[PDB]
Amino acid sequence: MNIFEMLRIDEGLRLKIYKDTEGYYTIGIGHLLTKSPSLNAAKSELDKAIGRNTNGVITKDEAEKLFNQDVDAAVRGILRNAKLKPVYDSLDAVRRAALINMVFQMGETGVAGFTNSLRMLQQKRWDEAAVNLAKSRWYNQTPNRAKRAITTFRTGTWDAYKNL
Ligand SMILES: [Cl-]
Ligand SMILES: [Cl-]
């Protein structure tokens, strides 16, 4: 198991524009297009991202390419973030993947706001951090996915993703 496989399980793969859990236009493997309520705005962002007139539909290769870019961007945002970087450096390989997952889903800013959980993770207080992470809108709105990430942080293994 690795970050790519992990996120592919959490986000799924859709080749036509769709609305995510928050109702935002998205495509591929969780690639957010726009928070705007307009399909046109979404189609236009898609074309700009792919480099062609797509008509709201892309191929698998195109989806994977956006995915690669997005993971890279997520890692780069963590490393550039003063609050995130120290946490990430302190963690093992499996838990790093869970932090990337969260950044991919909610953005650097969002994650950087979990101050208390971040400090617990850096301290290696696994159970405590897991309880604190669950007290969030994130867990209440997408509980199954949040549970998977939280279990990951708690155990340092891929058990939550094994079977999926
Ligand atoms: Cl892009
Ligand atoms: Cl969920």
Q: At what angle do helices 126-134 and 115-122 cross, to 10 degrees?
A: 170
70 included as an active-site residue: no
The residue whose two tokens read 């799924």 is: 12
Q: Is the Cβ–Cβ distance between 104 and 70 less than 8 Å?
A: yes
Q: At residue 27, what are phi and psi to the nearest 5 degrees? A: -155, 165
The structure tokens listed for 138 are: 């994130």
Q: Which of 42, 122, 51, 130 is nearest to 88 (CA)?
A: 122
Annotated binding residue 136 = no
How big is the CA angle at 69 (ends 117 and 14), to the nearest 5 degrees? 90
How big is the CA angle at 99 (ends 98 and 104), to the nearest 5 degrees? 95
Give the 3-state secondary structure of residue 19. Answer: strand
Distance 53 CA to ligand 2 centre (A): 33
Q: Which of 5, 10, 11, 47 is catalytic?
A: 11
Q: Which of 22, 7, 31 is nearest to 137 (CA)?
A: 22
Structure obtained using: X-ray
The dihedral sign for the CA sequence 52, 58, 64, 66:
positive
Cα–Cα distance for residue pair 110/52, rounded to 1 Å? 31
Distance 12 CA to ligand 1 centre (A): 18
Helices and strands, number each (H, E), in the chain = 9, 3
Distance 20 CA to ligand 2 centre (A): 11
Annotated binding residue 117 = yes
β-pairing, 25-28 vs 14-19, is antiparallel
Q: Which domains does the chain have, with CATH numbers?
A: 1-164 (1.10.530.40)
* Beta carbons within 8 Å of 93's beta carbon, 6+ residues apart: none
Q: Which of 10, 20, 62, 108 is catalytic?
A: 20
* Beta carbons within 8 Å of 109's beta carbon, 6+ residues apart: none
61 included as an active-site residue: no
If one counts every other C-beta atom within 10 angstroms of the C-beta of residue 78, the result is 22
Cα–Cα distance for residue pair 129/119, rounded to 1 Å? 8
Q: Which of 103, 149, 109, 150 is nearest to 129 (CA)?
A: 150
9 alpha carbon, distance to own chain's centre: 11
Cited resolution, angstroms: 1.7
If one counts every other C-beta atom within 10 angstroms of the C-beta of residue 43, the result is 18
Cα–Cα distance for residue pair 61/153, rounded to 1 Å? 31
Cα–Cα distance for residue pair 3/14, rounded to 1 Å? 19
DSSP string covering 90-114: HS-HHHHHHHHHHHHHHHHHHHHT-
Q: Is the Cβ–Cβ distance between 30 and 24 less than 8 Å?
A: no
